[PDB]
């Protein structure tokens, strides 16, 4: 009485094609449980139908044939979680892909867990410094916040994310454990050589130590690409639920949607708007709701997400683009026009927002950039309204004079994340009018000179602004003094 293959805990493949197995049997499987194929290939139980189980396959279905035995696992899909993963490159299921040995994982976590409710969280209040003036000054990001990076191909979306990961050494190399931020970088649909390029740079910046990289690339099965985000999320909640701080980049959520769309159509689920499943909003809401700030009652830890979405022809009104803009706590919109024009980052002031506002900003920063955002918005308008110097008054000549100078200061190169006090020093100079008489073309050069001066000579003012976290009345006076005088010697 060989009773190893009863149809309650095992089944047999009725048919297989395009990564979808229609398994017979599996009478006791649970929706969303993981199953195993004779070939050591894992799959996931998505459709539990009267006469069959629709199984999505986490790998090449070429090794699966009609008749194969499929075995339950009794477990709803999960993955390795914890500090062991830092500095490692894993696939969408947790397996290492840096051929640097097994992960020493002691904890596991379901990839699909609902986000903490109302009661367990507290308003986002601690800054999450990117290192990018434009961002940290105009569209501030706090911990527990979800801020979207969106724009066409090549407008610089990933860069924002890398600079951010790199900027975190400051605190991670420090003492304070509350200021530390562990990062997670999920590649989806991307190309292996690009990721390999990516993890190299991170290594060269001495950032891998605090980063985990979940990779679900271009040739990985649709279901791996699909899962990848939830997988990476779960690794971030480990830190979030243990009073630690995590930052996750979903690069990008566009390719995942495609994966979802594919997986979903191959299951024969009727296509919806634009060919995607009627629940693509849900696909991303469920995920991004998980980035959150827990109250002290739950460890005070947090998860901050920076999902990426690719627009086409800079059209942000597009259905997917708006679907995701309506989930996150703001967006950073990058335009190719601005980029080519010299404005890098190509952040579009007017169209980007932060729903957290200044609550995610240090007082030093709030002090200097409190009204700048709506000022630049109003500047872009009149700058357009006078692309014909229409008998323009002074209030608007002053508006155009600040607008241009401030625009130059928000410019920034790559890989050189600035420290908060450094940002405050340079914005200060502009916002206060000390630069209204310098020539726009000069501004970039001046900022390198000025910053040099204060960093070298004046670290007492930098350390105080940084420390007090505010701009006291004397600091504000020591600063006025430095800028005006250096400026003069500078314009000799």
């Amino acid at each position: 009485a060989d009773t190893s293959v009863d149809l309650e805990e095992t089944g047999r493949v009725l048919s297989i094609g395009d990564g979808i197995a229609r398994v017979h049997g599996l009478r006791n499987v649970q929706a969303e449980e993981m199953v195993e194929f004779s070939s050591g290939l894992k799959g996931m139980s998505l459709n539990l139908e009267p006469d069959n189980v629709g199984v999505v396959v986490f790998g090449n279905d070429k090794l699966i044939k009609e008749g194969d035995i499929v075995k339950r696992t009794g477990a709803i899909v999960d993955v390795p979680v914890g500090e062991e993963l830092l500095g490692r490159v894993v696939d969408a299921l947790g397996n290492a892909i840096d051929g640097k040995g097994p992960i020493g994982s002691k904890a596991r976590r379901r990839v699909g867990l609902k986000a903490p409710g109302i009661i367990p969280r507290i308003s986002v209040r601690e800054p999450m410094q990117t290192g990018i003036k434009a961002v940290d000054s105009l569209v501030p990001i706090g911990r527990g916040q979800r801020e979207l990076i969106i724009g066409d191909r090549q407008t610089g979306k990933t860069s924002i994310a890398i600079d951010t990961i790199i900027n975190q050494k400051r605190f991670n190399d420090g003492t304070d454990e509350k200021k530390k931020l562990y990062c997670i970088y999920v590649a989806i649909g991307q190309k292996r050589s690009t990721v390999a390029q990516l993890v190299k740079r991170l290594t060269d910046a001495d950032a891998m130590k605090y980063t985990i990289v979940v990779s679900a690339t271009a040739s990985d099965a649709a279901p791996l690409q699909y899962l990848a985000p939830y997988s990476g999320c779960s690794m971030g909640e480990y830190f979030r639920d243990n009073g630690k701080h995590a930052l996750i980049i979903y690069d990008d959520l566009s390719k995942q949607a495609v994966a979802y769309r594919q997986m979903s159509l191959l299951l024969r689920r009727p296509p919806g708007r634009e060919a995607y499943p009627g629940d693509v909003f849900y696909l991303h809401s469920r995920l991004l709701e998980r980035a959150a700030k827990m109250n002290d009652a739950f460890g005070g830890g947090s998860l901050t997400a920076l999902p990426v979405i690719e627009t086409q022809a800079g059209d942000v009104s597009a259905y997917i683009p708006t679907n995701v803009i309506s989930i996150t706590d703001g967006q950073i919109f990058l335009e190719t026009e601005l980029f080519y024009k010299g404005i890098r980052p190509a952040i579009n002031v007017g169209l980007s927002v932060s729903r957290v506002g200044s609550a995610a900003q240090t007082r030093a920063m709030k002090q200097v950039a409190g009204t700048m955002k709506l000022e630049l918005a109003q500047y872009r308008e009149v700058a357009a309204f006078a692309q014909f110097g229409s008998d323009l008054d002074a209030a608007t000549q002053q508006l155009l004079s600040r607008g241009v100078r401030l625009t130059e200061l928000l410019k920034q190169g790559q890989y050189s994340p600035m420290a908060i006090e450094e940002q405050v020093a340079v914005i200060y100079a502009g916002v206060r009018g000390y630069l209204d008489k310098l020539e726009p073309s000069k501004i970039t050069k001046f900022e390198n000179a000025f910053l040099s001066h204060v960093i070298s000579q004046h670290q007492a003012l930098l350390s105080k602004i940084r420390t007090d976290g505010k701009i006291s009345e004397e600091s504000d006076a020591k600063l006025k003094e430095i800028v005006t005088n250096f400026l003069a010697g500078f314009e000799a």
Binding site: Y282, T371, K373, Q378
Partner: protein, 467 residues
Amino acid sequence: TTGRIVAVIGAVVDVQFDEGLPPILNALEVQGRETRLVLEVAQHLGESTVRTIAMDGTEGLVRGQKVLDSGAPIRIPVGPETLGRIMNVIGEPIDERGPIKTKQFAAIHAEAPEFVEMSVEQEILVTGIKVVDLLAPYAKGGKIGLFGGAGVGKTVLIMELINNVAKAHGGYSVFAGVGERTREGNDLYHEMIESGVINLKDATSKVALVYGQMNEPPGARARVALTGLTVAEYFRDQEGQDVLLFIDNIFRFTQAGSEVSALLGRIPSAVGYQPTLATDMGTMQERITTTKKGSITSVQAIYVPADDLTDPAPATTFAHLDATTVLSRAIAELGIYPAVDPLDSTSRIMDPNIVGSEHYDVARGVQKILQDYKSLQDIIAILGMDELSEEDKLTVSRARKIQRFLSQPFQVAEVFTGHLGKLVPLKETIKGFQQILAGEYDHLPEQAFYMVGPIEEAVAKADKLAE
């Protein structure tokens, strides 16, 4: 009755009953679960099998699992002991403060008030917001709609109205969060408390809350509005009070339905929507209403997919409103908040017979000039401004200043504008515009009119700018 689960595909679960088939709308409870899972019966497939929508996650369900017919549609705790509390789609407290000990329970599904139950009183409801008041006045007991694409101001606008109106309101308020951001229900709850609208120690709570956010399965999202609305109907009928209903965002109810629609076996209507969109919206919107028994003042946020106001959903909702505030990313983009579109916002009380001719002539006066300027915009763009008649370059002037005088620093967006929130009284509004239109400020600079409350601040700001 006891049925078994025969198929699970997402939020849709098919159940087979041996004897006694639960009627459509009935709620069934799945046996064997750490948490309460309710399934609403959606259809009778035949063969004593019903197709249902899950009110929560379907993970771990098994074919063959047991399901008991509860014998009635989802019923929730309704009454005064709901005030100051936070409820679920299915009526469970989610605030960790214990049971909700109501005398009665109500089914979230119910018929809308009959035609002979309608009321036609029309009283302006002043809000303190220049634009709304001036051009698209809200009406007490009326149906109000805030239309807007992602991130243009729907919620903040709902936030400042709670402050400028809900806060003084002598009556209850019900705020139903439908498919919106969890972070947001936590911001509001704690704000209600810090301002005593919610009292955790006594019975002075003047607001009940119901939530079915974006982290929920379609099913929950297709019903929270019902739960929310049901709580509100109680205070309207059984107590006869003046209710204030806030829903953010009702589009989510309709997106919820479109998300399971295909699994319900339906040919899609246009734009992907389900073929029953309008009727689904109708039987709901028709309950959100003032009657002779009580009064409801509903403020509903309405999402606009792809920013397209013609999208079957936003498009289908206009007919259910008495006043509409249409927000626009093109306005917002310029830094003009609130980003209301002055030429696409309307109110059923913008009638000389109701607000008066001074109110009316100003409003229309402001709209003509903004329209007049809209038309010229594209043209002076290319052909420039020299050739324009001094008569026409004055309307460009006044328009650009009005465009600004219409912005205002909200008290709930100081974190955004870096400006103290201003609330302007209806007469300060009418007058301010009357004067701009009258040529009484053609000397001050436009910028003086941007982000200010009353016209006097525009005059003061001119000086401050004077240098």
